Amino acid sequence: SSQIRQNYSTEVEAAVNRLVNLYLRASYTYLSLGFYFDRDDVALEGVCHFFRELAEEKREGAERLLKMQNQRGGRALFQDLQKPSQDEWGTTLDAMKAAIVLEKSLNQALLDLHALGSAQADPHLCDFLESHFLDEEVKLIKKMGDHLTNIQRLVGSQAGLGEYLFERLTLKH
Amino acid sequence: SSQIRQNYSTEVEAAVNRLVNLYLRASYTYLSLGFYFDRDDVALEGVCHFFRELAEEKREGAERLLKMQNQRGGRALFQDLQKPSQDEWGTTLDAMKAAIVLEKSLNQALLDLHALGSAQADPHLCDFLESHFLDEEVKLIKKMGDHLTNIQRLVGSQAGLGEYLFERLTLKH
Amino acid sequence: SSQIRQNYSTEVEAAVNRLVNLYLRASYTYLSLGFYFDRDDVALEGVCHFFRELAEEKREGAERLLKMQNQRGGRALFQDLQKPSQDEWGTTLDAMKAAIVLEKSLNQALLDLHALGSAQADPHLCDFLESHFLDEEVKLIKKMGDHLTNIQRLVGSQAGLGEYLFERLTLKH
Amino acid sequence: SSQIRQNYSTEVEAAVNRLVNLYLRASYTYLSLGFYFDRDDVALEGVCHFFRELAEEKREGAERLLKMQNQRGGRALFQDLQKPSQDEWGTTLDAMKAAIVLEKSLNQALLDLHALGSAQADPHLCDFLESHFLDEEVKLIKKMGDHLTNIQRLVGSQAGLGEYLFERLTLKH
Amino acid sequence: SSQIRQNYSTEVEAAVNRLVNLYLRASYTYLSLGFYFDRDDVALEGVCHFFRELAEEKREGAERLLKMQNQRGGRALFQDLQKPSQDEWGTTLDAMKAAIVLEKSLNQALLDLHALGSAQADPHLCDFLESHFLDEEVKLIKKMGDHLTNIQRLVGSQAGLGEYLFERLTLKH
Amino acid sequence: SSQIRQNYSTEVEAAVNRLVNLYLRASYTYLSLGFYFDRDDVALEGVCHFFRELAEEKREGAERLLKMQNQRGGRALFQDLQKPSQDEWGTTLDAMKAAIVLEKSLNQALLDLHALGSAQADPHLCDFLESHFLDEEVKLIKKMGDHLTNIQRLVGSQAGLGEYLFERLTLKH
């Protein structure tokens, strides 16, 4: 409310609400990815676990944004959550490509909000993103890039064998 | 898939997917309730905590359903998640009335799925609901009923004072 | 001194000295608030403790600024400390309103110094404020806002009773 | 207030308020002394620490007086705090001479308040000063005297070397 | 690579490579300083240790930059490392003056990279420098300034004696 | 210096300085190798770790030589460090071949210095090399030879798969 709000623009308030929606939609996508890899006809437990953990991380990102919104005196507004873009996600390689595209989209939304906060001279917002989101995102994207490279070197050789080895020897199970 | 599926009707498969949607929408509603009570102009920490815990419980209910869907060889299908029915939730009394209506709707969906499973002679489904959902729901609704009665006796007396006392002396903070 | 000073403008040096004065004056105001609530004819121990703790926090803020001033090679200059604006502070509600006004004034001074540092391309100063002051201030103002709302809901009901309950059940004693 | 006040003269009440001002001004002077010795072009950490500790002790003395004022039913009244008498404090010798002058002034104010309390037959006040202030002050002044003598014997020999040795081998760092 | 790179300019990539070179050259200079003070005809163990520790810190700074370069999808490129500017480093005073000049040069390179990142709207880079380099550098330069002042006060008095005392009583051995 | 130097030829002094340069250049090469394998488009963590550890070992070898130089009364002289011979290092096989060539070059420089020390009847130098370098080098080269053989047997079969297996099952991560 108005009792505490200080130096917090309506444009930032609205963008924060949009970003919450994007994080929750990412969480939902990761939930779908995770349960796909737990199907009896897919059955890659390490891949399932990887995406389930990301679903949790994105949900937590949204909750941190909502906490911040209240700390600044903005008002959280929730919208419909669009279902994930696919019902089936293909191979580990297809899934990891889809995940890195998703993360780059989230990262772009973070960068755009940082630029808005810079333009509106809102240093608390800029710091908040720097401290809790931007470096986490860079580290995650690097990890996904590393995974992509390793999956590609394996399935180029021999696809089924390669996918099993990656799940067994890289991913946690 | 077809490799494991046994005695698992398409009608039950579809209803399970619908029930996942209903649990996730309940989780989302509770997320909105929780953050409403964390607003600086509402500021009832115990109420916030109560609804945040319920958001987690409903999400976990959905995840258990999705696990079961895969164990039976059904295929999870995700739909859009409708936003919560309100943006602001009124007083603790208004919120607790809305929550018990929501839980009765979930309970009815559980009972309807149990009846379908009975009709289709699917004892695993019926047991699964009995063991993980039906008694949890009855206990939760009883707790909400108890809360409603206590809130009503307090705010009938003196509304602001009453709401504070309930949050301080009944709810966990 | 000149031996270490690098990228540290005279405008920032002077503003830092002014900010030290503002923090020390805030500390002094909180000392007066705290001892007011320890009077035998006021006697709200939890309120006394709350403001005494804030006096300590603001003094520590000033000491951190003075440490930073020396680390950058600026020179601390001390001015007279103006006495607090009131000798008696009214009710818990009056006191908490006065405190949030004071904190918003401090927050504005922080934001103005951050803007100056941005304009002078002094990233160390900007980081220092972000890391040690801006988020602490936002969190404090949110907490005071929450308190204000709870005090208002209580004393609207029944003023003396309400003030006692807040001190007993919200504030630490 | 009047509810508890007994055998507590208006003259003593006023003098106690004056003494609080003198202690807080002493604390402020010691804060300036301490940060002077932390300058990069002074850089005597042990001297800095010595005066910072005294700033804390004098602040605590003021807080004890304010507590006593309330225990007797007097009313604390705060005045402006005059800035310290110097912006730069010279050598360790200059600083220690200034500190002992300050302490003798505080001690004289304590003795004058004790005499007033004796004249007004206020044994609680006299005891309070004896038990919490007078012996502490005598011990501090003796310690400062000892320091002065040691600094003088060192800087008479060789000023820069002497000041370093005193800071390293007498003062705590 | 291109798979992960996002919002990372070629100008920043190149400057990061240059900064790695500057840190490694600083590390090398400190290695030379450290072993100079371990010569039998110099023999100041505490001074040796001080510069050896700085060699390690600068190497670690370079490694952190190289890690960051890879996390952003840039490509590390290594150049020749220029030998230190001197073969013999004079007295402790001469050495500490040379070290503070070196650190101010590094600090300027950090500030210039921060300005470039600000201009290119690269908040991750700006945060990275703020969080890992800028405050460390300010603290180090302050410590070197303090040392310089203490060395100057000692060797003004009596040069050989003064240098020994500083090494024994200030520096760690 | 001349105060301690005994049976330490100028030819050995100079060769020791050259050997320090060769060790530091080896360390630098290993730093480049290590960070190459940490690229998102290479992404072999175990290989990265292997070369990073060797960078540390070679740096430590140089520091031991510099310590010895001072213990004998020689004077360390530092030269420019040439950049590594390649900017990109190819596959694990290419990298391990380059590393064994580098180690054989270092080993030859050690053997040549031992021969010089033998010819100059400097038993301390000969012992120092025997005790700290020659056996370490033989053991390292044997380990690299073993690795080469295992990498060759794997990538002859199936290159991408083979390189992944070696990194996962032989190298430490």
Ligand SMILES: [Cl-]
């Ligand atoms: Cl809608």
Ligand SMILES: [Cl-]
């Ligand atoms: Cl749709």
Ligand SMILES: [Cl-]
């Ligand atoms: Cl004045």
Ligand SMILES: [Cl-]
């Ligand atoms: Cl006044």
Ligand SMILES: [Cl-]
């Ligand atoms: Cl070259």
Ligand SMILES: [Cl-]
């Ligand atoms: Cl050269």
